[PDB]
Amino acid sequence: MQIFVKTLTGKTITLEVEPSDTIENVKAKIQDKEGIPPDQQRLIFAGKQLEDGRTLSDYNIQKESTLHLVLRLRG
Amino acid sequence: EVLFQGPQNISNLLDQIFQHDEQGAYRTLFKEVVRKKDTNRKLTGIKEPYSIDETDPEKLKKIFLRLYISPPKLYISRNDRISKEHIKQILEAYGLQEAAPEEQSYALLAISALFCKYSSSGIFGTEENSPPELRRYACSLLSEVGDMRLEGVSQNEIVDYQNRLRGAKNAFTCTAVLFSTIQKKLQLLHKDQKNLKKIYDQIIPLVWQ
């Protein structure tokens, strides 16, 4: 199924995923597309930070859902 | 003259960095904030009160894009390089076009520190978030410092600073602390060098010294 990952800078990233995929798997797919190291990625859905180890289905993330990406860069 | 030229010095630098800010509001903001110890106006585009604008991240990406040799990616890379022309411009802004390499390299470290401060929790960043284009600019200036070399700063220290700015695994990313660290380095380096102390006082805003 397709999901979308919206960046802060305007780009929307399209991914092909399965409901059984882990958040880490999704971060690795973002790395494939954009080069961003998984350890720097913060993924957000419905105002919640998504945790590595949990699955898309765990967060009831369905087809055509939109996630948001923030880089872990502290001021 | 150092007192009278303070505002003109920072303004001249920011006119170069923000030359592609056609609307001009970020250029003005970066100049005005240097009178302040801190500000509630944050450029992270992230709601977390702070004055937030969700368009800040895209607009900053667009303003800084042309300063690089190749268009940067979303993440910060030690292979992101500022154009040699823009390096010349920012040095010319301070009358250092033909100064010694040791003075030019010190100036670039100071400008890097300045962007660490801009990106930090007291200025345009928060405890947990920080505008990536400000960090990217500081990181890429450090690549120039590393190539020119600077007495009192090792290549390992440069890479450490870059790893923190870029968010490398196992690096403490906080730019408020990184600014303090680079500031202490710049101070140690100008302790017995009046020429370097002059460059420091041209670049670092009074309120942030």
From Swiss-Prot, chain A:
Annotated effect of mutating residue 42 to E: Impairs ubiquitination by CRL2(KLHDC3) E3 ligase complex. Impairs ubiquitination by CRL2(KLHDC3) E3 ligase complex
Topological relation to the membrane, as annotated: Peripheral membrane protein
Membrane-spanning residues: none
Domain of life: Eukaryota
Post-translational modification: Phosphorylated at Ser-65 by PINK1 during mitophagy. Phosphorylated ubiquitin specifically binds and activates parkin (PRKN), triggering mitophagy. Phosphorylation does not affect E1-mediated E2 charging of ubiquitin but affects discharging of E2 enzymes to form polyubiquitin chains. It also affects deubiquitination by deubiquitinase enzymes such as USP30. Mono-ADP-ribosylated at the C-terminus by PARP9, a component of the PPAR9-DTX3L complex. ADP-ribosylation requires processing by E1 and E2 enzymes and prevents ubiquitin conjugation to substrates such as histones.
Residues with (Microbial infection) ADP-ribosylthreonine modification: 66
Crosslinked residue numbers (Glycyl lysine isopeptide (Lys-Gly) (interchain with G-Cter in ubiquitin)): 6, 11, 27, 29, 33, 48, 63
Site residues (Interacts with activating enzyme), renumbered to this chain: 54, 72
Positions bearing the site annotation: Essential for function: 68
Positions where Phosphoserine occurs in the chain: 65
Outcome of substituting residue 44 to D: Impairs ubiquitination by CRL2(KLHDC3) E3 ligase complex. Impairs ubiquitination by CRL2(KLHDC3) E3 ligase complex
Record domain Ubiquitin-like: where: 1-75
Localization (cell): Cytoplasm; Nucleus; Mitochondrion outer membrane
Function: Exists either covalently attached to another protein, or free (unanchored). When covalently bound, it is conjugated to target proteins via an isopeptide bond either as a monomer (monoubiquitin), a polymer linked via different Lys residues of the ubiquitin (polyubiquitin chains) or a linear polymer linked via the initiator Met of the ubiquitin (linear polyubiquitin chains).
Name the record gives this protein: Ubiquitin
Organism of this sequence: Homo sapiens (Human)
Gene: UBC
